Design an enzyme around this catalytic site. Structure first.
Site, PDB file in Angstrom:
ATOM      1  N   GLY A 168       0.818  -1.194   0.000  1.00  0.00           N
ATOM      2  CA  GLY A 168       0.000   0.000   0.000  1.00  0.00           C
ATOM      3  C   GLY A 168       0.857   1.250   0.000  1.00  0.00           C
ATOM      4  O   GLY A 168       2.075   1.195  -0.134  1.00  0.00           O
ATOM      5  N   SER A 202       4.913  -4.294   3.849  1.00  0.00           N
ATOM      6  CA  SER A 202       5.555  -3.154   4.500  1.00  0.00           C
ATOM      7  C   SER A 202       4.564  -2.406   5.382  1.00  0.00           C
ATOM      8  O   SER A 202       4.851  -2.110   6.547  1.00  0.00           O
ATOM      9  CB  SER A 202       6.150  -2.220   3.446  1.00  0.00           C
ATOM     10  OG  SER A 202       5.222  -1.981   2.402  1.00  0.00           O
ATOM     11  N   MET A 203       3.384  -2.101   4.843  1.00  0.00           N
ATOM     12  CA  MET A 203       2.354  -1.438   5.631  1.00  0.00           C
ATOM     13  C   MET A 203       1.587  -2.451   6.463  1.00  0.00           C
ATOM     14  O   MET A 203       1.105  -2.118   7.551  1.00  0.00           O
ATOM     15  CB  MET A 203       1.405  -0.661   4.720  1.00  0.00           C
ATOM     16  CG  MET A 203       2.105   0.154   3.641  1.00  0.00           C
ATOM     17  SD  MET A 203       3.587   0.999   4.227  1.00  0.00           S
ATOM     18  CE  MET A 203       2.912   2.048   5.515  1.00  0.00           C
ATOM     19  N   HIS A 222       9.987  -4.616   3.931  1.00  0.00           N
ATOM     20  CA  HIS A 222      10.911  -3.990   2.998  1.00  0.00           C
ATOM     21  C   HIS A 222      10.885  -2.480   3.197  1.00  0.00           C
ATOM     22  O   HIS A 222       9.944  -1.923   3.765  1.00  0.00           O
ATOM     23  CB  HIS A 222      10.561  -4.339   1.544  1.00  0.00           C
ATOM     24  CG  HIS A 222       9.267  -3.752   1.073  1.00  0.00           C
ATOM     25  ND1 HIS A 222       9.162  -2.461   0.600  1.00  0.00           N
ATOM     26  CD2 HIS A 222       8.023  -4.282   0.998  1.00  0.00           C
ATOM     27  CE1 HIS A 222       7.910  -2.220   0.257  1.00  0.00           C
ATOM     28  NE2 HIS A 222       7.198  -3.309   0.487  1.00  0.00           N
ATOM     29  N   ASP A 237      14.736  -6.697   0.573  1.00  0.00           N
ATOM     30  CA  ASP A 237      13.491  -7.413   0.825  1.00  0.00           C
ATOM     31  C   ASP A 237      13.737  -8.494   1.868  1.00  0.00           C
ATOM     32  O   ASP A 237      14.740  -9.211   1.807  1.00  0.00           O
ATOM     33  CB  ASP A 237      12.962  -8.037  -0.472  1.00  0.00           C
ATOM     34  CG  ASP A 237      11.998  -7.127  -1.232  1.00  0.00           C
ATOM     35  OD1 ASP A 237      11.542  -6.099  -0.690  1.00  0.00           O
ATOM     36  OD2 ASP A 237      11.693  -7.453  -2.399  1.00  0.00           O
TER      37      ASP A 237
END
Ligand SMILES: Nc1ncnc2c1ncn2[C@@H]1O[C@H](COP(=O)(O)OP(=O)(O)OP(O)(O)=S)[C@@H](O)[C@H]1O
Lengths: 190, 191, 190, 190
Positions: free
Chosen positions: B67, B96-97, B121, B170
């Site tokens: 996102g 990530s979010m 990441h 990553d």
């Protein structure tokens, strides 16, 4: 006291005859009960006894006797209930406030809305208050009166419709016991 | 194609969508890529639930593959600002979010499923134009990364240097491995 | 899809959208690129709330990345006219118009979240065509920037010379640094 | 369009959708490709039913051509966590994450239609970018691949080595063969 007490408690009979009944009975009881006392005078005490007995109540209609219970109403109530002590103060004061003769003539003695989570014991306070004050107990559940046509079960059906003959349980119970305590469980669902 | 459920509440029976009924129980659903539009619903639900009962703890499912950083932060700030403890369960996937919001739940209340996959990441952003503008924009993306690592360290408890090494490239963390890292706690597994 | 939330009322529960119930509590949300329809929608909400209550503050959450400048002016002129102070709580990104909308907020009620970011830059209305028409279009954009900057400095209070110098190029301000610059009077954390 | 069905309830007639009516009887339809949004919807239906009656068994009908492996894992985790036995009836077709969720159903209640056809293949995921990024993403596909074999071997009951060789290449299993393989306990009988 006799005339005022008969209208307050003996609702079934009218004032002219019922008042004489109390005076007549007090004379017979004032003469029979004394054993060498020779208490010819008829004080208010004798009036309380006869009115109570003929009214079929547990000594509720007595003068200067309630004041002893009102003095320690919360104390004797706290021995049968544990917790919610603050509620006892609000309930007992309003009761005394109404009993002091300062209330309104066109309103009940006192309208209260007990509010607390289920199981706290509001019903226990009421089942013990009635026994304390010597009044009957009326218990209704609004869970069965949530429909539109079920509301008539309290006041009664209108004339010419089903349910008219027996009448309404609420008004009937009130007329049978005008001094009882009215308990309505789960009023919000109504 | 949202099914309807009947709630046998007092005085009546009302029909509500499956998602709406769960919102009554303080169970918010986060699904798909985060964006300004979907974020308003989660923020709206959190604020609405707080008014109804601040004492009760809100719940939050995370099934997002990533996102927008800006829209994600709004959920993070709103989650912390609200008094209720926000549980952070992860269903199916994290990103990530998804992982940044997963670790923001009240310590102890946060949990994770056995087969959940957490991907952490660094923020990725691309800008084109005048050289001077890219330099200003370049500083912003670096600062956002710095703000993410420090906030992540506060919840996870890991040193900023350790997380930066993993975050630079990553990274993937299994559900058991995530517990040691500190992103989440293991599920009760009690029935 | 928007979840339906039931709002308890004395008459009974009534289902309402999540946004609808928030509006009832004076909470208005803003998001997405500014549009004429979007701007007019937020305008109708502001007018309804003012009539409902003329004193209680109307919250305005701005989580938009910027949009058409002309559409934004309608929101700004509606916010100043209404008597209740607008609480412009920035819950995320705030582009040029986003910054203008929150700055227009009444002083003393503007709040910002800890991790929010406010991006301020100049307007861009670049148009290509005949030089004759571009002259009027070129003159118009500066007038809006001057008018916006003049009104912006009135709200913040910073020197107009400094604002234009900074706004010439894209500027990024953090939530802590935003209060230092005067964009938001205070920060809301608890 | 979705047809509407009427339910015969003593209180009053209740409208219902074809899917919502079956949902009231603990029946879930896993129709279409596995997706984040569709999978999340199924998760909510499972929780809703669990709260209403955990003792009862929740039925799940899997007719899907497969989809995102990550989304399907969400259905697998919630299914075991919920006390209700998640029966799995595979109608028409099964594929990656269709068979995995079919086997994941509670033992003794898994079933397959006579003409249903199962399909099991290794997850096919590709990543593009710098060499370093492919190394991390490639390793993740190895971990999940092994994780499915381990869990599939558990419910199916087959040896780990047999599953790896079979899953290496796409395998189509008929409903009678599925019972022999172990994916389902037995075929549905009229
Ligand atoms: N505080 C208490 N003190 C003494 N006995 C209690 C108390 N609370 C409950 N009990 C006992 O528990 C019994 C069952 O509780 P109920 O009277 O049925 O409660 P209830 O009236 O439904 O509760 P609420 O909270 O008033 S709606 C009572 O009749 C008492 O015998």
């Amino acid at each position: 006291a006799a005339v005022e007490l008969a209208v307050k408690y003996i609702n079934d009979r009218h004032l002219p005859d019922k008042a004489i009944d109390v005076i007549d009975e007090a004379g017979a009881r004032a003469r029979l009960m004394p054993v060498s006392k020779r208490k010819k005078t008829v004080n208010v005490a004798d009036i309380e006894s006869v009115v109570a007995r003929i009214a079929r109540i547990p000594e509720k209609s007595v003068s200067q006797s309630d004041r002893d219970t009102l003095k320690n109403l919360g104390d004797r109530l706290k021995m049968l209930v544990f917790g919610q002590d603050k509620a006892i103060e609000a309930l007992t004061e309003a009761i005394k406030m109404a009993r002091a003769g300062l209330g309104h003539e066109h309103k009940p003695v006192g309208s209260f809305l007990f509010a607390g989570p289920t199981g706290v014991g509001k019903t226990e306070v009421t089942v013990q208050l009635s026994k304390a004050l010597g009044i009957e107990l009326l218990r209704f559940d609004m869970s069965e009166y949530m429909e539109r046509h079920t509301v008539s079960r309290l006041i009664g059906a209108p004339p010419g419709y089903v349910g008219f003959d027996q009448g309404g349980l609420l008004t009937d119970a009130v007329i049978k016991h005008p001094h009882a305590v009215l308990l309505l469980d789960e009023i919000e669902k109504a | 194609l949202v099914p309807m459920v009947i709630e046998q509440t007092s005085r009546g029976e009302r029909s509500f969508d499956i998602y709406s009924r769960l919102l009554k129980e303080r169970v918010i659903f986060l699904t798909g890529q985060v964006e300004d539009h979907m974020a308003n619903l989660i923020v709206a639900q959190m604020l609405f639930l707080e008014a109804e009962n601040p004492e009760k703890d809100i719940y939050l499912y995370i099934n997002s593959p990533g996102g927008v950083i800006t829209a994600g932060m709004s959920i993070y700030d709103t989650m912390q600002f609200i008094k209720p403890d926000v549980s952070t369960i992860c269903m199916g996937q994290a990103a990530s979010m998804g992982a940044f919001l997963l670790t923001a739940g009240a310590k102890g209340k946060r949990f994770c499923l056995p087969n959940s996959r957490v991907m952490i990441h660094q923020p990725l952003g691309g800008y084109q134009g005048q050289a001077t503008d890219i330099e200003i924009h370049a500083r912003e993306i670096l600062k956002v990364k710095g703000r993410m690592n420090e906030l992540m360290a506060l919840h996870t408890g890991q040193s900023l240097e350790q997380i930066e090494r993993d975050t630079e490239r990553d990274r993937f963390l299994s559900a058991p491995e995530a517990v040691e890292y500190g992103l989440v706690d293991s599920i009760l597994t009690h029935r």
